[PDB]
Amino acid sequence: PPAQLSVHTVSWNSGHERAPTNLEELLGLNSGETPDVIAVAVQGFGFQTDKPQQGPACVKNFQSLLTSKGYTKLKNTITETMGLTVYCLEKHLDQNTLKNETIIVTVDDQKKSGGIVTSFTIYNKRFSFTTSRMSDEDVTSTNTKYAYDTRLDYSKKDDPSDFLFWIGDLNVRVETNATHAKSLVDQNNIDGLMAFDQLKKAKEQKLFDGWTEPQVTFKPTYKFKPNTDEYDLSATPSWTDRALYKSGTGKTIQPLSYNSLTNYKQTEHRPVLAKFRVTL
Numbered sequence: 191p192p193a194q195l196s197v198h199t200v201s202w203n204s205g206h207e208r209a210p211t212n213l214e215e216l217l218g219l220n221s222g223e224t225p226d227v228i229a230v231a232v233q234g235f236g237f238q239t240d241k242p243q244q245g246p247a248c249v250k251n252f253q254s255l256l257t258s259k260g261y262t263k264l265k266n267t268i269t270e271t272m273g274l275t276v277y278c279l280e281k282h283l284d285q286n287t288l289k290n291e292t293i294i295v296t297v298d299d300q301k302k303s304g305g306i307v308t309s310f311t312i313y314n315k316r317f318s319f320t321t322s323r324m325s326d327e328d329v330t331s332t333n334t335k336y337a338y339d340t341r342l343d344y345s346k347k348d349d350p351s352d353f354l355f356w357i358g359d360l361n362v363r364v365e366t367n368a369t370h371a372k373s374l375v376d377q378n379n380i381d382g383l384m385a386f387d388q389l390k391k392a393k394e395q396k397l398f399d400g401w402t403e404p405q406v407t408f409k410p411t412y413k414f415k416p417n418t419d420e421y422d423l424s425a426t427p428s429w430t431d432r433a434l435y436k437s438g439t440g441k442t443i444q445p446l447s448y449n450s451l452t453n454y455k456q457t458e459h460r461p462v463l464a465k466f467r468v469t470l
């Protein structure tokens with residue numbers, strides 16, 4: 191039982207885009223770090239049907255890179271609009287106690303909104319990783335547009351998990367006009383623009399209760415004109431992909447870094463990579 195473990199998470203509202211082939215950077219591996227757990231969440235369209243037949247390349251390329259580095263894929267789960275994969279270094283796994291479990295929650299009859307939770311235990315500590323997806327137009331258990339449901343929140347369980355991460359596009363946006371938002375971006379007044387971000391409003395409404403986001407120092411990750419760094423100002427620049435963390439049991443979770451990956455310009459959103467150190 192080590193004293194600490196490291197976790198990398200990445201999420202990307204990737205839409206109809208295929209997985210990139212350059213993955214080390216996406217997963218935070220390109221400077222030689224060797225995290226214990228890696229979670230990858232995507233939001234988009236057509237994953238399960240997989241008309242593009244891109245599933246095969248995803249498996250090949252992720253498994254090619256990660257197996258050589260000592261990772262085991264605990265689970266991949268896909269729906270039409272969401273994907274969540276969790277990897278862990280094989281050296282941490284005790285099959286007798288791992289209790290690897292995933293649930294899918296769907297909130298609409300077309301199964302386009304809801305979320306996924308994958309959980310597992312190592313060294314007698316329980317990890318849970320959630321992703322979620324909500325539409326602006328949906329009727330919901332919260333009567334909000336935010337991608338929260340209590341069924342996805344393993345901190346509000348009778349026996350809450352030790353380490354919890356929630357990654358993806360939460361459908362939280364910046365609630366001001368585009369002109370003001372862009373001016374704050376140009377001034378690098380990130381905290382000033384963050385004053386208009388809806389996560390605090392969601393929390394006031396008792397969504398994401400007690401969940402923390404690492405400090406944001408990067409510019410909004412949406413909406414870009416593809417292959418550029420220029421905002422498409424048809425939308426107010428916003429922080430779409432987010433990483434939130436919590437412990438149900440008083441364990442320390444220390445973010446090490448939290449950044450958008452601006453080299454992945456293929457789409458209107460930029461991926462967001464978080465790195466944490468957890469104390470068992």
Ligand code: HEM
Pocket residue numbers: 202204205206207208209210230232234235236237238239240241242243244245246248249250252253263266268273275
């Ligand atoms: C940036 C975008 C994407 C990322 C990061 C991504 C990531 C992943 C990851 C990490 C896995 C698990 C790989 C493993 O086995 O180790 C996976 C599986 C899969 N992905 Fe993607 N994916 C993306 C886009 C897509 C798209 C556009 C499609 C097609 C609509 C798709 C279809 C699938 C399917 C069907 C699987 C499961 C296939 C199987 O289990 O044989 N993905 N993806």
